[PDB]
Every structure is written in structure tokens, then in C-alpha cells.
């Protein structure tokens, strides 16, 4: 079609399937296996990318060009890698992926949205869509084209360290919140076939429905463990949102570390090929989790040859290696060379990978747009996060007796007020895991507004605001305070580090609440990724708010505390009386909740 050196796969006017087939037909085995390989930026160099025909890069949690890097530093990094991949014989661009799971959260100055559990409290799928949209822009600001989100796990036991990454214990809520997908990717056409991948263009990103399947059903909430449930329960609780994702054109699906009735998901051909590909008709690419194939065996890594065979025969298309690429490539090449893995399986994985890259426009815009850099941390996005944070708050108590004047909303004018607690002025704690570092961190880790900062920005100029992190009872009684706001809760955690069998917040937390509330009427703001033992905090407090992990915009908290808006959030999870009850979900025999799923008190705006 019209020049003498014309190559159909390079012609942007041709249909994606024709471009895929035309490119696939020219590729060597090495070129094919290279597409199937995703590596960490930490092991990538121009020569490694070129010589191994690498298909994809990622940043794992905390893998950044440097601390504090600007949006343009990210763009330059990603373009440097792309430049190498475009210099190969076939010039196939790489796709760069990152965990942008509550904003573009690895990046300094990125807007940090509430974590998923809080978003489930909003019951507002359109808000989540808009959060998708903002997140796509902030990811493209850094030159990155692919976000490992949404997590559509249905957490069935809050002892799990990733329970905050699940919108709800109720699959219906999780289903509703798959609107993140068309936020990230754009809306699919009227005509769209369910299971086809979609991304609108250069201002959107490929999404990833993760982690397939039953990641939130593991025994005792143990991370990466076994999920014991008949096919009917799997299909009724853990699967449904995957079908909503297919309907909205999710481009990729990541496989779970977890097992189903003892079968490693990363080795499960019946579910990956038989169900996801052959029954749901998924036509995007299937990606492993980080060393997910390694973890097929025990010990992990003990038979990498079998890891590669089992995973690729099960139907995985791209492997998140992410470090030992030479070994992965060498072993997979051996398997194809000895007939253990047929060419048809390679060609299917590469078809899927190229389908997503061509569909999303990556061959037409392989490089970053520097005009997008300024999207990072844009005030419109912070305003959105602030709206989400406010809508996520669940008011659990507002008055010790039914006859008390309701404490909330608090007045903005008062002579003197106290702000206290370990979580009142700690941005890191209010963001939780997957913020700047993998495990999150403490203190002023990025740009945002702590609860203390938000109180000071909200109150009348005549209101004196005193901060004390852990005041004693006498300090409070002697202080002349009108009221206190006290914020406490969980420390940041991610993944197995957050698996917790007792779910009691660290001290001092409760002790500070008791000392503050003992002296002056108090509003307790509980920061957590999940329900935690709360009766003692409730007993001390006039009012108590479950604020979850609200992110960078602390003003979302004060917007509701001071009555600019009313509380509307409703628990997206059951709140247990005791961890001995667990697991306990809306539906079981012994359903005896402290607060039932859907509970939440309200207030009216002042
Ligand atoms: C970088 O993510 C985590 O890093 C630690 C330490 O290097 C690993 O040992 C963990 O098992 C992974 S977990 C895995 O990471 C994916 C990529 O960051 C992520 O998308 C997925 O949701 C996680 O399960
Ligand atoms: C399928 C699976 O992951 N099972 C693990 C098992 O290997 C381990 O003995 C245990 C440790 O707590 O957790 C569970
Ligand atoms: C009261 C109690 O036992 N608290 C513990 C804490 O010390 C520990 O770090 C965590 C580990 O999951 O579990 C919780
Ligand atoms: C300040 C306040 O409590 N206002 C009201 C309450 O009396 C009522 O339950 C409802 C009626 O609109 O709205 C709220």
C-alpha cells in the first residue's frame, strides 16, 4: 500500500489484526520470546533491551530513577529504554508498566487517591471512573503506558495484608467499581466485543484486572496462599468482576500467586486457558505476577525449567521475570527447540501482546509527551481525590448517648482546639502502602496535606490550633480546649507484611484517644486498611470516623468534620466484633457483626 520499502505492520491505517499477523510472520523465535519477557528497569540497559528483543519493562514498588524525580526525569528514563527497543530490527516498542493503584503512587508529587476499600465505601462508580481518568493522565505524565490496576480481589478475610486493595467483601460492589477500567483506558465503542483489549490512545493507559482468581479468598487471609472453595463459590464470589472487566475491554489480566484447591493459579491451564481465554473470550494478554512462575514450586525457584513449562503451557503470555531474563529466555527457547512447548502457544502469546500494543497506539506514539508532565499532581486531580476522601469516610458514632448533642459537625470557630495522635500529622501514614515505597513510609514522603494541615486551613482565623502527638491526660484537661480531633491507626503495609492475625492498632493509639477524650469532647479519626478492633476506641470517643487510607488530600477529612459536606460513606466490609469470628461475611450462619456491611451514620452539611 504505496511506498517501495512498505511494511504493512508499520502502517497506522491498517486493521490491528492485519498488523499483528504481518509482524508475527516476520519474527524469529528470539524476537517472539523477547516480547514475552518483562524486566525490571533495574536490570535494563540499552544493549539488554536490543540484544534480547525485550517486550516490556516495569517498575516494581519503589523502583524509581531517583528519589524526588520529576515527571520529566521519568519521561526521559522511559524514552531511553524505548529508544533502545525501537532500534531493534523490527522496531517493536516496549510497554512500560507500573503499580499506579491509587494514583501514580511511586512518583513524588503525584496525587494520591484513597485506597480501594475507601472507594468501596463511596458506592460511587462514577467517582472511581474519574479517578481512573486522572490516574491515566498522571501516569502518562511520567511517560508510562500501563498500570497494574484495578485490583478486583474480593477480600473475604480482613486479616489479609491486601484487604485495602479490595473495594469490598461483596462482589457486587467490586463489579460496580470496574468503572476504573474505562477511566484508565477510555470508554469502549458502542459495537464492542466483550474480551477484546481497548485503550483509547496516547492520553490513556492499558489496565490490568488482577489477580486472577480468588486472591481475596485465601485461608485465614494468608497472602499468596490457598483458596479452598468449590467452583460454584469461585464463580459466585471471586470471578464475576472479571466478566465486567471483559465487557469493558480490560487490556491485560495478571495471574495470582494464590492457589485454588491446591492448584497454583500460575500453573492452572483449566482456568487461564479454559476459562479466561476460551470461555470469557479474553483476547488481551495474560501476565504473571512478580516471580509468580518461580513460586509454582516449593521451594520457589527450585525448578525454574518446570516453572517456565507449566506457566506457558497454562496459558500465560507475558512473564514478569523480572530480573533473571537470560535464564528465562534460555529455558523457554530450549523448551520450544525440544518440542515441549509448541510454536502455536508462543504465537498465541505474542499475538496477544502485539494486539494490545497495536490497539493502544503504542506503535504510533512510542515516546512520551512532554506537555503531559504538568498533569502530575494537578490541582483538579487533588480536588477529585479530596472529594473521594470525603465520600469514603464512614461515621461510626456521633454521640456517646442518644441524648447527647451530636459532636459532628464541629464548629470552625472556637477559642482553642487540640489536634492529636500519631496519624494527625503524618502524610505517609494517611496514604498507607504503595505510596513512594512499596511498603509505604512515614512522614512527609510526597506533596499533600496532613489532617493537622487541613484543620489549620479550615478553621476561623481566631481559632488557636494546638498540636500534640501523644498528650497526657493533664495536658488536655489543663489546655482550655473546645474539642479535640485525634487521629490514630495502622502503620503502612503492603502484601504479606500486612497479614495480621490480631488486627489491633499499635500503641500508642488507644492510650492517646483515652487521654484526649477523657479531658475534652473528641472526634477520633481511625486510619486503617480494614476493620480493626474498635470497641475500646468507640467506648472512649464522642465521635469516631473510619477514614480508611484517604491519601494525599487530608482536607477530605476536615470537609466532613467541619460540616462543609455531610457524611455519606457506608461500610464496604463487615466490621467484626472479634478476630475469633473470622472469617465472617454478610451471609453466613454465625453473622454477628459489630457493624454490618452497609452501615454508616450521616450528617447534614452546616
Ligand atoms: C515490587 O513488588 C513486590 O516486590 C517485592 C520485593 O521485591 C516482591 O518480593 C513481592 O512478592 C512483589 S509483589 C507483586 O508485585 C507486582 C509488581 O510490582 C504487583 O503488580 C502485584 O500486585 C504484586 O502481587
Ligand atoms: C498454597 C500455599 O501457598 N500454601 C502455603 C504453604 O506453602 C505454607 O506452608 C503456609 C505457611 O504459612 O501457607 C500456605
Ligand atoms: C497485640 C498484638 O499481638 N499485636 C501484633 C503486633 O505486635 C505484630 O507486629 C503483628 C504481626 O502480624 O500482629 C499484631
Ligand atoms: C442537623 C440535622 O440533624 N439535620 C437533619 C435531621 O434532623 C434529619 O434526620 C434529616 C432531615 O432532612 O436531615 C438531617
Residue numbers in the entry: -3 to 602
Task: Provide the authors' original text about this structure.
In the barley β-d-glucan glucohydrolase, a glycoside hydrolase family 3 (GH3) enzyme, the Trp286/Trp434 clamp ensures β-d-glucosides binding, which is fundamental for substrate hydrolysis during plant growth and development. HvExoI folds into a two-domain structure consisting of an (α/β)8 barrel (domain 1) and an (α/β)6 sandwich (domain 2) with a 13 Å-deep active site pocket embracing the subsites −1 and +1, positioned at the interface between the two domains. HvExoI catalyses the hydrolytic removal of nonreducing glucose (Glc) moiety from a broad spectrum of poly- and oligomeric β-d-glucosides. The crucial role of substrate binding in HvExoI implies a pair of the aromatic Trp286 and Trp434 residues that form a clamp at the +1 subsite, which is positioned next to a pocket-shaped site at the −1 subsite, housing the Asp285 and Glu491 catalysts.
On the other hand, in W286F the electron density map of G2SG-OMe was defined at the −1 and +1 subsites, where this thio-ligand formed H-bonds with Asp95, Lys206, His207, Arg158, Tyr253, Asp285, Arg291, and Glu491, and stacking interactions with W286F and Trp434, whereas G2SG-OMe did not bind to W286A and W286Y. The dispositions of G2SG-OMe at the −1 and +1 subsites in the W434A, W434F, W434H, and W434Y mutants revealed similar structural features of the ligand binding to those seen in W286F. Notable was the behaviour of W286Y that showed increased catalytic efficiency values with (1,3;1,6)-β-d-glucan (laminarin), laminaribiose (G3OG), and 4NP-Glc, while these values in W434Y were considerably lower.
